[PDB]
Design a protein around this nucleic acid. Structure first.
Ligand SMILES: Nc1ncnc2c1ncn2[C@@H]1O[C@H](COP(=O)(O)CP(=O)(O)OP(=O)(O)O)[C@@H](O)[C@H]1O
Ligand SMILES: [Mg+2]
Ligand SMILES: [Zn+2]
Ligand SMILES: [Zn+2]
Ligand SMILES: [Zn+2]
Lengths: 112, 97, 171, 178, 107, 271, 557, 84
DNA sequence: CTCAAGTACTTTTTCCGGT
RNA sequence: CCAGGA
DNA sequence: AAGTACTTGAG
């Protein structure tokens, strides 16, 4: 918890060194993201890219072919929840506009 | 023009879901394969016009679907296959969560 | 046999039909596709039961095209034959090879050899007949056949049937 | 697109085994005893004896003619003409299969009346025999317990020889005249 | 709890899991000289009951996985004698909300 | 790297901030559940000043011939004197304001009153004054109950989380905490009547607008906050290059930080 | 365009990774793939019934595919196969193959540690497929003996017999594409003192892997359905179809075969050599020679950039492009063909600022407007307008390029002998020129910002440059020293809405990056604004009247 | 499994994205000669027709808002507040 | 069996004519 | 690959 | 280059 506070303090100071102001929330998110696993998760292929996200998603950054080889070897199942995977699949990602579904109601249709 | 990763990124930031799908599909790559519902690969000998479907070595002349994926993805899957990796594409779930 | 079966069909409606006579267009498109149909999985889908209570559910609008997809849940009468099934039918055709028997929507063909020995072909009759010592089998005669095997053939199902064993043959 | 069921089973890569179907009462995956209706409830297999079947379709199309004429506001040889007319009214007409089925049923039905088919259905569904056997006992006219036990080879030890012969008596009595 | 001066032999340390359902804890006297919980940067952690946890997960529709984790070796996890699976509710002062509550599941 | 780490993160329909595993990153976006565009630097008056000058500004004492609201401030001014029942409300009020001050002083250790918060209250009051043509002479048609309770009610309508249970309602309470300190600070009885000179109607309109403006301010389930954060940290650093104690800083310190560099360049303590 | 298919259209909800069982490869295969020769049926320019279409995909563009009857843009490729004369390691699994041998007995195929060991039961407890394998390995790598009898889960005086086999285990080390062991031995208690040094054959590892129990291998990474360890060893090789390795077919009679088409023949040649060598008078060493060559060719076909240096280099010195290389980031599949693509309905030119444009508009040069096209559906609301644009043709500004029939077959207004007499029917599509007020995605790379890509109102103007309002300069980080910008035209009534409703320039005025406006008055306007507003600065009627008129929304007061 | 109407918790206000997707979807439908549930007061652009339908709350669409667990709350465009 | 130096791997901004 | 552009 | 992960060999 104190690691998170230190980490932010330290990040904020690089941005604020230049003078430039970045809203809390953005730094907080990054800081939180590295933190949540229980320790200091690097923003490298050794950090986030080795977490339990989808094979297609992780293969899109840094270790590629190697990631896909271990996918085949351990019979990995891609959830297909990540932006990246839907981009690779050419599907509407569950991002903003795609975060929900649209339905026609015959009830409302017959009312008008 | 190349609609780069950085460019994708802003569309993701805007939440322009359909817009991104259109750039990556409709207005580029966009292709149609026939996949098998048992061994989730591009195996299907879709003689569309004769309405014959088949996937010999599944003996599946029934459980077949069509999907719209970027041709580069069709390619990626065929490339991984050539390298012994099976990227099985499935049109339903099992895991839930 | 002849079953009532709970089935469901996904139909994709074009926006031009997003009028208030929608459920009606859907109920009919279902019948167009489903009714009369013949699959190996379910056999002959003959008649959709309970038209008044067909479950349309909510239609999901398909992203880049305008259309909406509905899984039309329903219940219908199906005919799915099996081997070992003893069926009563009427003769339809007759040759030196055997005779076809019409069993509901389906045809069961009885081989010259799938019949008892006594019963033999007779080309010299109108229409050609199978003449036994005491029996005669021709185009209008009613027969009781045992289905030996089935073949799922596109928009149909066919079968080879025996009349050689006990209690089978002409009725 | 084609029709789906209520049986969802995840056949993941594992293609086959597909055992033959028989009078070892070994019907399909789809035609097994423990079915599921759209209400999600476990329901039993619905097998019909041609007459139990004739009356279902007859009823269905009759009630379809009601719905059709509402939405449009703003003796055997004689039953055959009556039915072939109702088909032209409610069915696709392209559906030759139903026209054949309806005639076959009209000519091959063992019980003409709903009340008659009622008692058939009562008498039989008290044997514990499986929907198939129960329908086959309804659609096949048998005299010897043997005739029936030979044509429906599943029955084999499932019923008494005398009990089946007792049932065969009542089905012959119920048998509507033509 | 066992407060040791310098060390505990690899011999003695093998007798720690020996007596269940009862539990044992090792603590180097030197680490304890200053209380870490008192630090500016260390927020108010609270161990949740078996019922409280059940509610947390029900109330947010979570699997145990989805919860931000705390290491079992974590100084504060040791301080409270946190056991794997136990959740801590962390109350921090927020420059945005005034007070913000996070939760961490034990590792 | 910042984009690929955060890509999959967004606000869900429960205001929770989850990745593609549905793992909770932030329970509520940026601890407050507000969209950054809607935020503005506002001054939490209550934080600073002499304990003396705080009292002069906020305190109403209907039981003191000197510390009452003059009958020049409101119509009830005369009949309001010595009203024990109302002096109970004004006591709750002032005791809550003092609570607020001590709490804020815990959060903001140096007494920085200027913090970016949603709903610019200064503007709302300003706008009410020109909208209703506030007569800085004439006494208000407000009751102590009109102000005191009106504020207290608006507070219950500042909705970030909607759930009907203790966890969520206690989380809703928490999310709204700091905004309320500001709200109570700007809408205290003395402040409203003496400084703003708001009419009952003007006040009602101020309240409605705070409510509307607040609700508008909350983040939208679907907001792709992951990418947003990456670019918001990223973009500065990229221009901070492309354009025109001595501890490692800038681009290399940032590189040090994200990489979680063990052997760092200038390790320093501050005792 | 692609033709109608009766098959139900779906979305990929899950991707199930795994490995190819040789049996699957043979099952799915439409041909084997016997001759290194591409084609020329004895010089006769047509595909050989042996490599690259012995039923496979298709070439010629004319002439349909031999299996599906589709042809070129419809036919995906069709897979083939090569039965390898001897097993070979898949390059990618070489260390996982090693790490498995390290965990399992090299004789019985049992795990070197089991339920009986305490740290083992603790590690077997690990839920994570990767973390479990990690812990099993570090534990078993050191167990150099398969245990027959082991100390019981009580008193160690009475020893419980687990699985059988006593056998000493090798100390495996990799010698590039070869896995070699070193069994300690025993000889007068001392040994080693010179141990048993021998290479582990692909076939023996295979037979051990084959014997690894489901429960055993399933405790390691593996899944009994999709990926058994025996499938990390290649027996039957899939042959990718032409669409994967197309010939760059220059002139009529001339080849130009792909790098993979060569590498496959290389494999094919190495395989036939080995096959004949063993079937004939096997000179033993000559076999373990032609074997290791086929192991190389099968290795380098998938990954050419291997640690053990010799790059399989083309006769030209230049190295062969491995499949691994094709997918490696920034350029190449994932990063360069999928995460980013080259797009249609894109335009780019030199940008120059305009003080007479509105904040949200973008000056589009007539030539650019006349090229870019939006597909509009023939509806009764626009039927007449569209018929005029169609009359106008692809040369006039408010005009059209193509008309899309029900049939789906495009009518080129540029040539169509019926470009005049062309009667539009509802539900058709007219691809019309981009018009004043259409929403378009305007962008300036970098694109560090969400704001570096905003939606604008089209304004068709003369002169070859994209004109933008000066205040919109800042977000893009644009200037006019020779900067160029990109324009993207949405094609859906749906994507149009996405731009207009979410990413329009006026919506982006206040930035969440800093919780303040990201656009303001700049340069001339800022400089002049100071000058205009000093007390000192007064204006006579004549000018005041022109300044007043200039404000488009002035009340006339 | 679908949250009942009397158990819904999500914003009673329409998200920026929901509005955009609704307007897009209707425009795309209207454009494909779909039936219009409003008086076109001389309107010819389908986005403007959709804006009009949204204003009169005569759009027959439902937003299915999925929660991270998979469960969802169905909301009519008629029932959603439009403060955007 | 714990300890150290050594080797193994992986990457380094975005977009846009001539040999 | 080389030479350039913001 | 430059780092860090991973594996190696000496004490
Ligand atoms: N190599 C590069 N890579 C990426 N972006 C670049 C780039 N070079 C230039 N740019 C883009 O173009 C801008 C550079 O402007 P330049 O033409 O170099 C003059 P400057 O040094 O930025 O300002 P100045 O002329 O007032 O001294 C950058 O701020 C950036 O957004
Ligand atoms: Mg410039
Ligand atoms: Zn298949
Ligand atoms: Zn083909
Ligand atoms: Zn062994």
């Amino acid at each position: 918890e104190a690691g998170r506070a230190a980490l932010y303090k330290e990040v904020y100071n690089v941005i604020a060194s230049d003078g430039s102001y970045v809203n809390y929330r953005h730094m907080a998110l990054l800081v939180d993201v590295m933190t949540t696993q229980g320790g200091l998760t690097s923003v490298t292929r050794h950090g986030f890219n080795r977490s339990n996200t989808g094979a297609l998603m992780r293969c899109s950054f840094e270790e590629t072919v190697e990631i896909l080889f271990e996918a085949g070897a351990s019979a990995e199942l891609d959830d297909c929840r990540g932006v990246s995977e839907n981009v690779i699949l050419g599907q509407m990602a569950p991002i903003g506009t795609g975060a929900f579904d649209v339905m026609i109601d015959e009830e409302s249709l017959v009312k008008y | 023009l190349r609609f780069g990763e950085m460019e994708r990124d802003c569309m993701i930031a805007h939440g322009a879901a359909s817009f991104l799908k259109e750039r990556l599909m409709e207005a580029s790559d966009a292709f149609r394969v026939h996949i098998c519902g048992i061994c989730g690969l591009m195996t299907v000998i879709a003689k569309l016009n004769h309405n014959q479907f088949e996937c010999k070595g599944c003996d599946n002349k029934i459980d077949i679907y069509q999907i719209h994926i970027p041709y580069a993805a069709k390619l990626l899957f065929q490339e991984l296959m050539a390298m012994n990796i099976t990227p099985r594409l499935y049109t339903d779930r099992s895991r839930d969560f | 046999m002849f079953f009532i079966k709970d089935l469901s069909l996904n139909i994709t409606l074009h926006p031009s039909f997003f009028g208030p006579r929608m459920k009606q267009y859907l109920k009919t498109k279902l019948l167009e596709e489903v009714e009369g149909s013949c699959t190996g999985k379910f056999g002959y889908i003959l008649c959709v039961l309970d038209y008044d209570n067909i479950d349309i559910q909510r239609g999901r609008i398909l992203p880049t095209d305008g259309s909406a997809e509905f899984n039309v849940k329903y219940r219908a009468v199906v005919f799915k034959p099996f081997k070992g099934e003893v069926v009563d039918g009427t003769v339809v055709s007759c040759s030196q090879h055997g005779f076809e028997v019409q069993v509901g929507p389906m045809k069961v063909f009885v081989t010259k050899h799938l019949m008892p020995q006594d019963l033999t072909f007779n080309a010299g009759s109108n229409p050609p007949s199978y003449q036994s010592s005491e029996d005669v089998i021709t185009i209008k005669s009613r027969i009781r056949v045992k289905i030996e095997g089935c073949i799922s053939q596109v928009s149909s199902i066919h079968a080879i049937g025996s009349i050689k064993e006990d209690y089978l043959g002409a009725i | 697109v084609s029709t789906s069921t209520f049986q969802t089973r995840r056949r993941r890569l594992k293609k086959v085994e597909e055992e033959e179907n028989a009078a070892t009462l070994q019907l399909g995956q789809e035609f097994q005893l423990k079915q599921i209706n759209h209400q999600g409830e476990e329901e039993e297999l619905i097998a019909l004896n041609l007459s139990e079947a004739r009356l279902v379709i007859k009823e269905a199309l009759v009630e379809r003619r009601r719905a059709f004429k509402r939405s449009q506001k703003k003796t055997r040889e004689k039953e055959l003409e009556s039915i072939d007319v109702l088909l032209e009214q409610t069915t696709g007409g392209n559906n030759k299969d139903l026209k054949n089925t309806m005639q076959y049923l009209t000519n091959f039905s063992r019980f003409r009346d709903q009340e008659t088919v009622g008692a058939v259905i009562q008498l039989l569904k008290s044997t514990g025999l499986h929907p198939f056997e129960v329908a086959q006992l309804g659609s096949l006219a048998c005299d010897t317990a043997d005739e029936a036990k030979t044509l429906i080879p599943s029955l084999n030890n499932k019923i008494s020889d005398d009990e089946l012969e007792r049932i065969l008596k009542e089905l012959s009595n119920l048998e509507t005249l033509y | 709890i066992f407060v040791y001066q310098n060390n505990i032999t690899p011999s003695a340390m093998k007798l720690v899991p020996s007596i269940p359902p009862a539990t044992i804890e090792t603590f180097n006297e030197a680490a304890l000289v200053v209380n870490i919980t008192h630090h500016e940067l260390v927020p108010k952690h609270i161990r949740l009951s078996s019922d409280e946890k059940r509610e947390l997960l029900k109330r947010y529709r979570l699997k145990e996985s989805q919860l931000p984790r705390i290491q079992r070796a974590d100084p504060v996890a040791l301080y409270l004698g946190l056991k794997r699976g136990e959740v801590v509710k962390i109350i921090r002062k927020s420059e945005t909300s005034g007070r913000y509550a996070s939760y961490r599941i034990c590792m | 790297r910042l984009v690929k780490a955060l890509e999959d993160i967004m606000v869900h329909y429960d205001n929770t901030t989850r990745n593609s595993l549905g793992n909770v990153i932030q329970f509520i976006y940026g601890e407050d559940g507000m969209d950054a565009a809607h935020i503005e630097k506002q001054s939490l008056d209550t934080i600073g000043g002499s304990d003396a000058a705080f009292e002069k500004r906020y305190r109403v004492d209907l039981l003191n011939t000197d510390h009452t609201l003059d009958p020049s401030l409101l119509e009830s001014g005369s009949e309001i004197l010595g009203d024990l029942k109302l002096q109970v409300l004004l006591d709750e009020e002032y005791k809550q304001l003092v609570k607020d001050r001590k709490f804020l002083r815990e959060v903001f250790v140096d007494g920085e009153a200027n913090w970016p918060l949603p709903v610019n209250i200064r503007r709302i009051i300003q706008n009410a004054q020109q909208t209703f043509h506030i007569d800085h002479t004439k006494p208000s048609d407000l009751t102590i109950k009109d102000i005191v309770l009106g504020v207290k009610d608006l507070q219950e309508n500042l909705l970030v989380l909607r759930g009907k249970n203790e966890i969520i309602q206690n989380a809703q309470r928490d999310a709204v905490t700091l905004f309320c300190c500001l709200l109570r600070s700007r809408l205290a009885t003395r402040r409203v009547l003496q400084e703003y000179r708001l009419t009952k109607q003007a006040f009602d309109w101020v309240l409605s607008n705070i409510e509307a403006q607040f609700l508008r301010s909350v983040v939208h389930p679907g907001e792709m906050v992951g990418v947003l954060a990456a670019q918001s940290i990223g973009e500065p650093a990229t221009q901070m290059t492309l354009n025109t104690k001595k501890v490692t800083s800038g681009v290399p310190r940032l590189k040090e930080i994200l990489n979680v560099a063990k052997n760092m360049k200038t390790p320093s303590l501050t005792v | 365009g692609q033709q109608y298919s009766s098959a139900p259209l779906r979305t990929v909800k899950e991707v199930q990774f795994g490995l190819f069982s040789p049996e699957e490869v043979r099952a799915i295969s439409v041909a084997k793939i016997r001759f290194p020769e591409t084609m020329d049926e004895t010089q006769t320019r047509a595909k050989i019934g042996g490599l690259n279409d012995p039923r496979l995909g298709s070439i010629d563009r004319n002439l349909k595919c031999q299996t599906c009857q589709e042809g070129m843009n419809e036919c995906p490729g069709h897979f083939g196969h090569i039965d390898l004369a001897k097993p070979v390691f898949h390059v990618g699994f070489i260390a996982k193959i090693k790490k498995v041998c390290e965990c399992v007995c090299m004789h019985c195929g049992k795990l070197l540690l089991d339920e009986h060991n305490e740290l083992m039961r603790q590690a077997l407890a690990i839920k994570d497929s990767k973390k479990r394998f990690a812990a099993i390995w570090t534990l078993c790598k050191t167990k150099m003996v398969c245990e027959t009898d082991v100390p019981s889960e009580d008193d160690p005086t009475q020893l419980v017999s687990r699985g059988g086999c006593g056998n000493t285990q090798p100390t495996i080390r990799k010698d590039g594409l070869k896995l070699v062991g070193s069994w300690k031995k025993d000889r007068a208690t001392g040994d080693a003192d010179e141990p048993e040094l021998r290479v582990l054959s692909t076939e023996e590892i295979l037979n051990i892997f084959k014997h690894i129990s489901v429960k055993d291998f399933t405790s390691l990474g593996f899944n009994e359905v999709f990926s058994r360890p025996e499938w990390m060893i290649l027996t039957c090789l899939p042959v990718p179809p032409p669409p994967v390795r197309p010939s760059i077919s220059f002139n009529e009679s001339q080849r130009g075969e792909d790098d993979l088409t060569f590498k496959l023949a290389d494999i094919l040649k190495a395989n036939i050599s080995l096959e004949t060598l063993e079937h004939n008078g096997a000179p033993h060493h000559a076999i373990e020679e032609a074997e290791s060559l086929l192991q190389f060719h099968v290795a380098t076909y998938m990954d050419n950039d291997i640690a053990g240096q010799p790059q399989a280099l083309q006769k030209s010195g230049r190295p062969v492009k491995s499949i691994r290389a094709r997918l490696k980031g920034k350029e190449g599949r994932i990063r360069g063909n999928l995460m980013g693509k080259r797009v249609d309905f894109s335009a780019r030119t030199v940008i120059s600022g305009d003080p007479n444009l509105e904040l949200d508009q973008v000056g589009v040069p007539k030539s650019i407007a006349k090229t870019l096209t939006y597909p509009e559906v023939v509806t009764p609301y626009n039927i007449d307008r569209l018929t005029q644009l169609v009359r106008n043709g692809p040369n006039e500004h408010p005009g059209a390029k193509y008309v899309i029939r029900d049939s789906g077959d495009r009518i080129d207004l540029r040539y169509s002998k019926r470009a005049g007499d062309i009667q539009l029917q509802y539900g058709w599509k007219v691809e019309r020129h981009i018009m004043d007020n259409d929403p378009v995605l305007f962008n300036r790379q970098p694109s560090l910002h969400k704001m570096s890509m905003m939606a604008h109102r089209v304004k068709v103007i003369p002169y070859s440059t994209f004109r933008l309002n000066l205040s919109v300069t800042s977000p893009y980080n644009a200037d006019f020293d020779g900067d160029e910008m990109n324009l993207h035209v949405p094609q859906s009534e749906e994507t149009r809405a996405e731009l207009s409703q979410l990413c329009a320039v006026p919506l982006q005025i206040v930035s969440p990056q800093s919780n303040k406006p990201c656009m303001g008055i700049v340069q001339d306007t800022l400089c002049g604004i100071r000058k205009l507003t000093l007390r000192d600065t007064f204006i006579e009627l004549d000018q005041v009247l022109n300044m007043l008129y200039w404000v488009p929304d002035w009340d006339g007061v | 499994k679908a949250i009942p109407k009397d158990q819904r918790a999500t914003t009673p206000y329409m998200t920026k994205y929901e509005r955009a997707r609704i307007l897009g979807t209707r425009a795309l439908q209207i454009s494909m000669n779909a039936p219009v549930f409003v008086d076109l007061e001389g309107e010819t652009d389908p986005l403007r027709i959709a804006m009009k339908e949204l204003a009169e709350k005569k759009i027959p669409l439902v937003i299915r808002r999925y929660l991270p667990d998979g469960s969802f709350e169905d909301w009519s465009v008629e029932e959603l507040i439009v403060d955007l």
